RNA sequence: AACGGGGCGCCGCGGCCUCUAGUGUACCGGUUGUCCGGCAGGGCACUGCCGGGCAGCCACGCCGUGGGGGAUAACCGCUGAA
């Protein structure tokens, strides 16, 4: 369905400064400064109009179809996430699961390593991005903290995908006669705010 | 069973001749029948035949022959509205 005018307003929280800048004919750059840090996002080639109105960020479209109109609600979700990112932070929690070979997980500098995954002599090594803090709690839990939800969630997804083999290395999920198979790995259990 | 680690091949490609092998009517030796009077030396038997064999060529011999980056496919995920 066609749309003539649509509008979405996002409420800026206390202590959070937003700078919406135009870097092209339809290109934006949004910098969000908070107590927890500074977030910078790009919105390139967008029909959505971004503007600041007295403590609010204004999103509007004009002559918009369904494809363009749904980008108002998407950008409200993104902008809210960046506000919470610099006011409360994000914490993604992972649980380590194994059956016979315990998975020695350690954080060495900016590298994350996992040992003995299924007894493999090989090592899993993941570079930790800047602005992402990785900690190993106990032997069984991992927490990723940061102010960017996309960057924290992306790294937490790459840890889980590390312990998921593909091709002919993939073990059977179910055991003999329908039982639980060899399911060992690191799984994202959920997310939370640092504060 | 697997990942990861170490070692080597086969097929192909590109070179090389130190070794080994082949050839080597350059060369050296042995020997048959006959002719040059005999010895010596030699012609011919289409290198007469047999053995060895430098160089050159050559393989049946030796040498080299890799990992990475990007955008991607099938697809797997993050965030994420309509
Ligand atoms: Mg000969
Ligand atoms: Mg004589
Ligand atoms: Mg004569
Ligand atoms: Mg002759």
Give the integer Cα–Cα distance in Å for A61 and A47: 7
Distance CA A86 to C1' B43 in A: 115
Interrupted after residues, chain A (C–N over 2.5 Å)? none
Number of residues that make up chain A: 195
Question: Which residues are bridge partners to A150 per DSSP?
Answer: none
Write out the H or E segment, with its range, that includes residue A83.
helix A66-85
Verify if strand B has an atom below 7 Å from the CB of A120.
yes
A173 in contact with nucleic chain B (CB within 7 A):
no
Helix, strand, or coil here: A97? strand
Crossing angle of helices A66-85/A149-162, nearest 10°? 90
**Residue A144 host element (H or E):** strand A141-146
Distance CA A30, CA A42 (A): 6
In which element (H, E) is residue A72 found? Answer: helix A66-85
Backbone angles phi, psi at A37, to 5 degrees: 155, -160
Question: In units of Å, what resolution does this entry have?
Answer: 2.5
């Amino acid at each position: 369905m066609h749309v003539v005018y649509a509008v979405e307003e996002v409420p800026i929280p206390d202590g959070v400064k937003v700078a919406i800048e135009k870097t092209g004919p339809f290109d934006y750059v949004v910098k969000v400064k908070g107590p927890l840090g500074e977030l910078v996002k790009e919105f390139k080639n967008t029909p959505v109009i971004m503007s600041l109105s007295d403590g609010k960020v204004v999103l509007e479209v004009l002559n918009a179809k369904k494809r363009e109109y749904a980008l108002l609600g998407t950008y409200k979700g993104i902008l809210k996430n960046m506000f919470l990112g610099v006011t409360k932070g994000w914490r993604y929690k992972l649980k380590v699961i194994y059956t016979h070979f315990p998975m020695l997980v350690k954080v060495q500098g900016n590298q994350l390593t996992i040992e003995n995954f299924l007894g493999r002599k090989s090592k899993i090594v993941l570079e930790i991005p800047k602005g992402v803090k990785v900690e190993v709690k106990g032997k069984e839990d991992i927490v990723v903290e940061g102010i960017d939800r996309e960057l924290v969630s992306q790294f937490a997804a790459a840890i889980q995908a590390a312990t998921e083999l593909r091709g002919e290395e993939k073990p059977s999920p179910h055991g003999r006669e329908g039982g639980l198979g060899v399911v060992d790995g690191i799984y994202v259990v959920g997310y939370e705010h640092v504060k």
